[PDB]
Amino acid sequence: ISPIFQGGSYQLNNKSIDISSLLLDKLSGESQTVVMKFKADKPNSLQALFGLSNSKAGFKNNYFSIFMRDSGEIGVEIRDAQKGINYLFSRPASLWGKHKGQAVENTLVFVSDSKDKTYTMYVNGIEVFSETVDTFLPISNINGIDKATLGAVNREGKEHYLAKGSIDEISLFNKAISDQEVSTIPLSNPFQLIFQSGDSTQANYFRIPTLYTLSSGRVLSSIDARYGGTHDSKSKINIATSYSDDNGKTWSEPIFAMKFNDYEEQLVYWPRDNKLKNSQISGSASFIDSSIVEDKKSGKTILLADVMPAGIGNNNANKADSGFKEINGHYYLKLKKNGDNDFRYTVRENGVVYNETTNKPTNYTINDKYEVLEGGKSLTVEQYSVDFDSGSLRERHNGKQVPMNVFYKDSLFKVTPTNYIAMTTSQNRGESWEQFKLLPPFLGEKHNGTYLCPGQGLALKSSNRLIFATYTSGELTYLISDDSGQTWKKSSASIPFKNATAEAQMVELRDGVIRTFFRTTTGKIAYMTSRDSGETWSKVSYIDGIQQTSYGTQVSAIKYSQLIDGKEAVILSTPNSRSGRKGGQLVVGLVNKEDDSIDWKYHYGIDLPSYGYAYSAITELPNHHIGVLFEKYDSWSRNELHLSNVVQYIDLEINDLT
Numbered sequence: 001i002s003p004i005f006q007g008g009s010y011q012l013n014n015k016s017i018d019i020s021s022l023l024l025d026k027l028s029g030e031s032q033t034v035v036m037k038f039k040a041d042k043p044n045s046l047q048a049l050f051g052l053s054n055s056k057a058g059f060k061n062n063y064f065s066i067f068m069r070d071s072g073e074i075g076v077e078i079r080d081a082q083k084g085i086n087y088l089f090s091r092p093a094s095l096w097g098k099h100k101g102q103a104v105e106n107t108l109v110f111v112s113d114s115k116d117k118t119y120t121m122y123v124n125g126i127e128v129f130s131e132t133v134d135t136f137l138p139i140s141n142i143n144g145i146d147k148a149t150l151g152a153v154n155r156e157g158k159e160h161y162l163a164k165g166s167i168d169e170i171s172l173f174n175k176a177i178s179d180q181e182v183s184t185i186p187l188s189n190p191f192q193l194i195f196q197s198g199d200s201t202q203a204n205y206f207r208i209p210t211l212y213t214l215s216s217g218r219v220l221s222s223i224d225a226r227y228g229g230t231h232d233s234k235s236k237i238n239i240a241t242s243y244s245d246d247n248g249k250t251w252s253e254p255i256f257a258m259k260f261n262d263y264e265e266q267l268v269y270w271p272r273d274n275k276l277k278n279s280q281i282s283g284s285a286s287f288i289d290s291s292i293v294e295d296k297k298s299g300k301t302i303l304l305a306d307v308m309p310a311g312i313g314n315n316n317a318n319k320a321d322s323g324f325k326e327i328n329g330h331y332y333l334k335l336k337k338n339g340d341n342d343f344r345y346t347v348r349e350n351g352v353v354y355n356e357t358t359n360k361p362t363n364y365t366i367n368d369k370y371e372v373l374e375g376g377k378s379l380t381v382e383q384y385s386v387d388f389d390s391g392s393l394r395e396r397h398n399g400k401q402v403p404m405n406v407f408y409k410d411s412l413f414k415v416t417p418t419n420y421i422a423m424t425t426s427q428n429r430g431e432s433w434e435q436f437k438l439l440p441p442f443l444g445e446k447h448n449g450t451y452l453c454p455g456q457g458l459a460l461k462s463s464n465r466l467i468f469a470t471y472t473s474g475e476l477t478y479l480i481s482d483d484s485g486q487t488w489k490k491s492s493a494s495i496p497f498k499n500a501t502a503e504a505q506m507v508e509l510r511d512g513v514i515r516t517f518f519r520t521t522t523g524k525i526a527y528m529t530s531r532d533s534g535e536t537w538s539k540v541s542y543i544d545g546i547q548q549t550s551y552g553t554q555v556s557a558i559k560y561s562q563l564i565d566g567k568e569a570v571i572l573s574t575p576n577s578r579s580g581r582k583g584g585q586l587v588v589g590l591v592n593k594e595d596d597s598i599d600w601k602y603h604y605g606i607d608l609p610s611y612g613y614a615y616s617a618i619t620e621l622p623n624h625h626i627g628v629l630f631e632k633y634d635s636w637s638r639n640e641l642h643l644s645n646v647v648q649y650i651d652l653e654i655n656d657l658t
């Protein structure tokens with residue numbers, strides 16, 4: 001239908017604009033849609049974009065508002081003191097502020113639907129909340145409404161929540177337009193989505209983006225497809241991938257690089273309230289933290305990720321057990337059979353399950369997919385699904401049979417409840433992935449696996465050497481292959497922290513010379529250097545001019561292919577903030593050839609200092625643009641859990657950064 005009111009080019013300069021005479025008598029019926037295109041690149045801490053209120057003395061709590069915070073949160077209040085109603089619905093990290101240093105036009109759509117008693121908010125094509133209520137309050141049914149205001153709410157005759165920004169366009173409709181109609185509203189987004197709710201992964205959440213540019217010109221991305229909210233393992237998480245063959249303009253429908261099937265892939269709206277938000281899928285196996293490299297010699301693409309058995313994450317993984325048994329210089333995966341309280345079995349050659357107590361082979365084998373066979377016959381288990389129908393998280397069998405896998409809760413034979421690293425390869429640049437294989441233990445029998453550093457591995461330019469950084473207590477542990485990923489050895493580099501999440505990414509400064517940038521516990525990004533292709537490593541130094549929080553955040557890093565100001569250049573991506581995971585920047589450093597020192601010369605603001613920016617991936621696209629896929633929210637904050645469609649992709653040119 002047609003708008004009952006439409007207006008535009010409203011400048012909000014800490015002075016409200018009264019539109020009462022234009023709008024109030026046009027409002028009718030119980031359902032309404034507001035469509036607002038607006039900018040706010042210097043917002044106040046809390047500000048109202050749009051207000052309908054009773055402005056009379058004695059009725060300060062009778063109003064409807066669409067408000068935003070300088071954190072990027074968007075929300076509404078719907079209040080009527082006579083009815084005893086005070087609704088407040090919002091979602092953090094819903095907005096853009098600036099892109100390439102210019103204010104972004106956000107497109108907000110708020111649907112107030114009396115028929116389903118639901119209030120739904122979209123920003124920039126993304127649904128950020130959908131809230132159904134017992135007693136519906138139509139936004140124009142508030143007792144004694146007499147003002148319609150832009151850039152404030154009029155309470156008792158005074159301007160509250162004054163806004164700084166602009167409303168380029170605003171329209172109101174006396175109808176709750178459908179989700180289908182919402183999708184037809186034109187957008188001006190500075191970003192793209194590669195992975196998103198409702199896509200082929202069926203995950204409602206995503207974290208831990210990666211990007212890597214392949215020799216064909218194809219750009220490949222991997223990600224955690226996270227089903228049980230944005231929680232780290234334990235949860236259900238798969239690793240998914242997507243690629244672009246046109247310099248990031250379009251992306252393929254995702255497929256899985258690593259997946260378990262003990263739990264259903266369910267798209268779930270995870271609870272965000274303070275009683276239930278920590279609900280966590282507790283009986284599922286998962287993968288977490290992926291990393292990609294391409295091997296020039298073989299042509300293979302290689303992806304590693306951590307693997308977690310059912311119920312396991314980094315917090316409860318057995319730190320004192322690799323899950324492997326060393327027998328005459330060889331490592332064998334240990335297994336525990338139901339009924340035993342110890343690990344009496346090993347997986348030997350050809351997947352044969354061997355009884356360590358009697359030294360006899362059993363009638364069981366493990367196939368290449370870590371599935372259990374008995375006398376050659378595939379065993380199955382019943383799949384679980386999850387729901388909150390009872391008012392709390394429930395995990396229960398769903399009637400479907402899936403292959404029995406040793407990483408599963410219901411398996412007859414189970415692996416050690418600790419963390420592992422697996423690798424898969426692709427021979428067609430991400431169009432399909434092989435079944436994963438566990439990497440061997442690197443730090444002996446009685447040590448849990450190291451933790452993969454998400455992002456990119458490093459292919460050295462002048463050899464066949466492949467390196468993936470990992471971390472554990474007290475060190476970075478580099479995994480090195482010179483044979484296309486068939487075998488690996490470790491190279492340990494001490495760092496002066498205990499129990500740091502030392503997520504590390506590497507650049508080759510020149511032939512044989514690797515610099516690694518990594519997260520610390522000190523508020524500063526650290527680095528170390530190898531001058532022998534990863535065999536040995538220097539002591540740790542720190543980067544000045546970038547601030548992180550005490551807990552830190554992953555940093556991504558690349559060596560740019562072209563000179564900048566006549567110098568070789570390194571680009572870092574990281575939040576730059578002492579408060580939270582916000583204020584994302586790309587930082588361009590120019591290398592001094594005399595000593596390999598780096599002058600951090602340019603700092604590019606991805607968005608506002610107050611807007612969220614957490615884990616990130618960066619890669620030089622084949623056309624020398626820079627692609628950035630990043631978590632546009634504070635992934636640490638306990639207030640910003642379980643947000644959909646906040647991992648976002650942007651395209652930048654070097655001139656934008658400098």
Ligand SMILES: O=S(=O)(O)[C@]1(CNC2CCCCC2)C[C@@H](O)[C@@H](O)C1
Binds near residue numbers: 211212214559
């Ligand atoms: O030099 S590589 O390490 O092979 C790599 C790709 N280089 C091309 C060179 C030509 C322009 C695009 C980037 C950089 C890493 O960040 C990965 O994207 C892989």
